[PDB]
């Protein structure tokens, strides 16, 4: 469904390749959106950090703004608890950029500085 484990594994493998490509200090994120009904926007994010560390974050919002807020909160939490700071990031949606993937990426890149 919206929490497909095979999907998750594909996102993690992609994010591993991304981390292997770009320099180590840059965090690599892969985000996907499921538009369950209209008040059930669910966001899945896979994050790879510098010192070979990883985390998976979810958000259940009704608008893209709430989803982005929860995403950024999880990002900051997983930075602080691993004793790391934000160097740079890169967000991709591997295959189907669709109903709300592009808008979520625009909001995520907006909430950066």
């Amino acid at each position: 469904a919206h929490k497909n484990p095979e999907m998750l594994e594909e996102m993690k493998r992609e994010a591993e390749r991304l981390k292997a490509e770009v320099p180590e200090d840059v965090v690599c994120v892969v985000v996907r959106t499921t538009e369950v009904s209209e008040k059930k926007v669910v966001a899945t994010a896979v994050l790879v950090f510098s010192n070979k560390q990883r985390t998976v974050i979810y958000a259940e919002g009704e608008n893209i703004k709430e989803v982005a807020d929860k995403l950024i909160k999880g990002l900051k939490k997983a930075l602080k608890v691993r004793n790391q700071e934000l160097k740079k990031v890169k967000l991709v949606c591997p295959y189907p950029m669709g109903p709300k993937d592009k808008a979520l990426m625009k909001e995520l890149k907006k909430k950066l500085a």
Binding site: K3, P5, E6, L8, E9, N51, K52, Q53, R54, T55, V56, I57, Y58, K77, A78, V81, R82, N83
Partner: protein, 166 residues
């Protein structure tokens, strides 16, 4: 330095993330944030030897149970955690232990049984019950509290030492 791959598994809410965060950051989380998969790395000195502990915090919820096979194949040591104030979580340990046993294809898998939340007085799993379970598994049993840091270092370093005996 020597690298030890530890995997923290158990039922949801028993405090796997709290224990791992207490070990890594010396901080206790009072918020329940359900986990899917988290990776941490920590440089420690155990018995005079410099180790890199690669700790993998797993998801205790019934969802994301298809990801068990991969990490139960990769990890070397396993912290099986239950909550002393959660009888069902204690009853859930056997399923994780059997999954690890069948995936590893070995009865001798480095494991430590961990009774978390020992700071709480609403105890429904007595120490001797978990001791009997651990004796059946032939593994150590340690009580820990992520709130007070009690037993956290003991549990993790005992898991490392159990890995050492292989």
């Amino acid at each position: 330095m020597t690298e030890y791959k530890l995997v923290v598994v158990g039922a949801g809410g028993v405090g796997k993330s709290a224990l791992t965060i207490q070990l890594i950051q010396n901080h206790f989380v009072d918020e329940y944030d359900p986990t899917i998969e988290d990776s941490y790395r920590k440089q420690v000195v155990i018995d005079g030897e410099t180790c890199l502990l690669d700790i993998l915090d797993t998801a205790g919820q019934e969802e994301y149970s298809a990801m068990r096979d991969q990490y139960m194949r990769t990890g070397e040591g396993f912290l099986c955690v239950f909550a002393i104030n959660n009888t069902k979580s204690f009853e859930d340990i056997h399923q994780y232990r059997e999954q690890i046993k069948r995936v590893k294809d070995s009865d001798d898998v480095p494991m430590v049984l961990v009774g978390n939340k020992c700071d709480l007085a609403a105890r429904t799993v007595e120490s001797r019950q978990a001791q009997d379970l651990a004796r059946s598994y032939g593994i150590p049993y340690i009580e820990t509290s992520a709130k007070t840091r009690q037993g956290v270092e003991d549990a993790f370093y005992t898991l490392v030492r159990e890995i050492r005996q292989h």
